[PDB]
Amino acid sequence: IVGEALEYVNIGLSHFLALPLAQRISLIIIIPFIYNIVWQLLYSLRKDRPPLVFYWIPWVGSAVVYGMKPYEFFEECQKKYGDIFSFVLLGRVMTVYLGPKGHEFVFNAKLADVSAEAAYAHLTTPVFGKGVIFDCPNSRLMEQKKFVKGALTKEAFKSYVPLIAEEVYKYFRDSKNFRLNERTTGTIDVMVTQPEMTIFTASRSLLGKEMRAKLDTDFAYLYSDLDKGFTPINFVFPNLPLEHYRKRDHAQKAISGTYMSLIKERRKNNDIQDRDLIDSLMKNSTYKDGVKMTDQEIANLLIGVLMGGQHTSAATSAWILLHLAERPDVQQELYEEQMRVLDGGKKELTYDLLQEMPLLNQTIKETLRMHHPLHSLFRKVMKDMHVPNTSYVIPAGYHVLVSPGYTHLRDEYFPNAHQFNIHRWNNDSASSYSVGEEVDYGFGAISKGVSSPYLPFGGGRHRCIGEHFAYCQLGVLMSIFIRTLKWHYPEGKTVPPPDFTSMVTLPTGPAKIIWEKRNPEQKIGGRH
Numbered sequence: 001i002v003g004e005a006l007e008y009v010n011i012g013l014s015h016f017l018a019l020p021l022a023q024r025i026s027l028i029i030i031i032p033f034i035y036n037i038v039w040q041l042l043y044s045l046r047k048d049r050p051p052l053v054f055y056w057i058p059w060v061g062s063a064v065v066y067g068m069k070p071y072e073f074f075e076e077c078q079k080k081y082g083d084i085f086s087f088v089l090l091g092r093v094m095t096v097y098l099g100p101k102g103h104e105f106v107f108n109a110k111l112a113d114v115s116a117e118a119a120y121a122h123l124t125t126p127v128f129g130k131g132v133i134f135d136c137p138n139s140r141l142m143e144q145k146k147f148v149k150g151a152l153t154k155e156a157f158k159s160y161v162p163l164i165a166e167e168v169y170k171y172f173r174d175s176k177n178f179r180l181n182e183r184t185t186g187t188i189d190v191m192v193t194q195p196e197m198t199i200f201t202a203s204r205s206l207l208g209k210e211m212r213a214k215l216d217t218d219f220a221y222l223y224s225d226l227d228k229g230f231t232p233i234n235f236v237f238p239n240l241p242l243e244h245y246r247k248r249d250h251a252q253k254a255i256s257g258t259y260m261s262l263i264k265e266r267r268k269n270n271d272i273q274d275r276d277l278i279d280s281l282m283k284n285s286t287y288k289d290g291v292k293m294t295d296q297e298i299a300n301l302l303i304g305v306l307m308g309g310q311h312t313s314a315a316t317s318a319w320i321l322l323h324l325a326e327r328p329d330v331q332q333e334l335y336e337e338q339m340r341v342l343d344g345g346k347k348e349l350t351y352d353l354l355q356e357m358p359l360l361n362q363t364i365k366e367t368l369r370m371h372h373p374l375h376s377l378f379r380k381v382m383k384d385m386h387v388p389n390t391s392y393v394i395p396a397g398y399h400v401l402v403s404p405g406y407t408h409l410r411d412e413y414f415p416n417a418h419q420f421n422i423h424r425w426n427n428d429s430a431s432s433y434s435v436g437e438e439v440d441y442g443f444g445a446i447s448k449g450v451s452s453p454y455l456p457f458g459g460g461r462h463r464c465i466g467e468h469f470a471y472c473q474l475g476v477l478m479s480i481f482i483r484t485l486k487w488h489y490p491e492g493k494t495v496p497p498p499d500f501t502s503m504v505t506l507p508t509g510p511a512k513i514i515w516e517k518r519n520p521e522q523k524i525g526g527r528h
């Protein structure tokens with residue numbers, strides 16, 4: 001008889017429940033630890049699954065090392081399993097596909113196969129507000145990107161360039177970090193100066209003079225509040241009853257409220273021109289089904305667009321300054337270009353003249369290669385995906401992770417990849433371009449192929465639409481920096497390592513540089 005054993009299960013269950021609440025808790029710990037380790041070992045037997053990176057702590061997965069040095073993580077994984085592999089991240093299984101084929105597999109994936117908004121909505125909806133970007137169907141996103149692109153035209157850029165220049169000179173004149181009319185040399189932290197320069201120039205151009213004027217008041221503090229709410233933690237803890245989160249939410253309401261105030265006032269004046277992104281969205285934000293964006297959605301879309309461009313651009317100009325700080329040879333070469341194109345500084349900078357500064361654009365290009373702001377782009381897998389030329393199947397509920405920034409740093413695709421060399425882009429200074437066929441997902445014709453090893457602006461339906469705005473802003477900014485100042489490192493200092501745990505791969509601060517005026521007696525005019 002074995003029925004005596006079935007009794008003994010029951011008995012065992014009872015004897016278990018009467019263990020001391022000390023031993024019983026550790027069992028509550030030690031059991032999932034063992035099952036996890038067992039499940040992985042069984043998972044490796046499955047060959048329609050990409051290799052899974054081993055980990056001890058359940059749920060947490062490889063979060064720590066991935067968070068701290070994702071490119072070094074990816075390299076070790078790549079050496080062991082090749083380009084396709086999975087790892088556990090805070091409850092989620094990420095399947096990484098490295099290299100150009102990975103770009104193709106994720107960026108060009110079927111709309112039915114993956115979802116970005118499913119990956120990203122928690123990160124962004126709390127910050128931007130409802131109804132826009134990733135809080136709406138992909139088809140709504142496609143048209144929003146079309147609306148915003150409508151204020152990012154060549155003629156807009158011609159009008160923005162002098163507005164941006166004015167803000168940069170204003171910042172050199174009035175900021176305590178510079179004060180060039182009073183000081184001929186000084187030390188700055190680029191992680192302090194660049195976010196300020198960035199929001200000032202982006203506000204003035206995209207949002208207009210009134211909105212820029214508000215950053216000169218206490219209202220600036222709300223931007224700082226909202227800004228602090230744009231962080232990776234939102235991936236895990238989007239909302240939780242703390243101080244941090246209420247300021248953020250308050251800020252969102254307060255800032256969207258201000259844009260709406262301006263919007264409603266411009267319409268109640270028939271004062272709707274072609275100045276800024278606000279005018280533009282007012283005139284052009286009706287979807288194809290005839291539904292119009294609400295004033296709230298318009299305001300929210302403004303916040304999203306300003307916030308995203310804030311962090312990518314601010315990090316990029318910081319890195320540019322940092323790399324040039326140890327390359328007086330490159331500052332020198334850039335200065336010669338400025339003198340040539342602007343006739344010794346006589347000519348006023350314009351959008352057309354910016355396009356005749358290939359070395360400057362190449363410098364932005366090379367900084368975006370060495371410092372892709374977003375080291376990992378995500379999609380949630382919605383339908384089972386088979387990985388071509390493999391037996392691999394990525395089951396729904398997984399996430400795919402693509403990382404062009406990792407490929408940016410591979411010697412195979414960029415010789416001496418960890419060397420800053422703007423001349424690798426000689427006669428190839430364009431922000432990006434297509435090597436063949438194009439396609440349109442609803443916001444303009446863009447490259448069909450996404451196989452370039454250089455993809456700072458992504459590709460496919462979720463491709464950036466800010467690239468030309470960013471080059472315009474970075475271009476004006478760096479053209480004025482170069483013409484006005486030389487700079488270098490404090491003794492024994494050099495380019496800092498990136499902080500891969502922040503929203504963007506900004507430098508680990510404080511990252512200080514020492515500036516000095518090229519023309520000590522040059523004064524910046526205007527009232528203050």
Ligand SMILES: CC[C@@H]([C@H](C)O)n1ncn(-c2ccc(N3CCN(c4ccc(OC[C@@H]5CO[C@@](Cn6cncn6)(c6ccc(F)cc6F)C5)cc4)CC3)cc2)c1=O
Nearest residue numbers: 063064066067120232304305308309312376500501502503
């Ligand atoms: C827990 C213990 C801790 C210890 C120390 O290990 N740890 N362990 C692990 N980690 C860890 C691990 C990983 C990370 N992150 C990985 C994910 N990252 C990330 C960032 C942004 C992303 O943005 C998605 C969209 C794309 O478009 C944007 C952006 N944009 C594009 N153009 C302009 N803006 C956009 C678009 C349109 C708009 F209109 C606006 C927008 F914004 C938003 C996607 C991914 C951040 C870093 C951080 C920390 C830890 O910290």
Ligand code: HEM
Nearest residue numbers: 309312313316377456457458461462463464465466469470
């Ligand atoms: C150096 C500057 C920038 C870089 C490197 C950059 C990079 C990117 C990348 C990689 C994506 C695709 C994300 C994904 O596929 O998951 C993206 C998307 C996007 N970016 Fe940018 N970006 C920059 C600046 C800007 C600016 C200045 C704006 C607005 C003025 C902007 C607005 C957008 C928008 C609207 C999307 C679409 C997101 C989607 O369709 O899912 N970006 N950007």
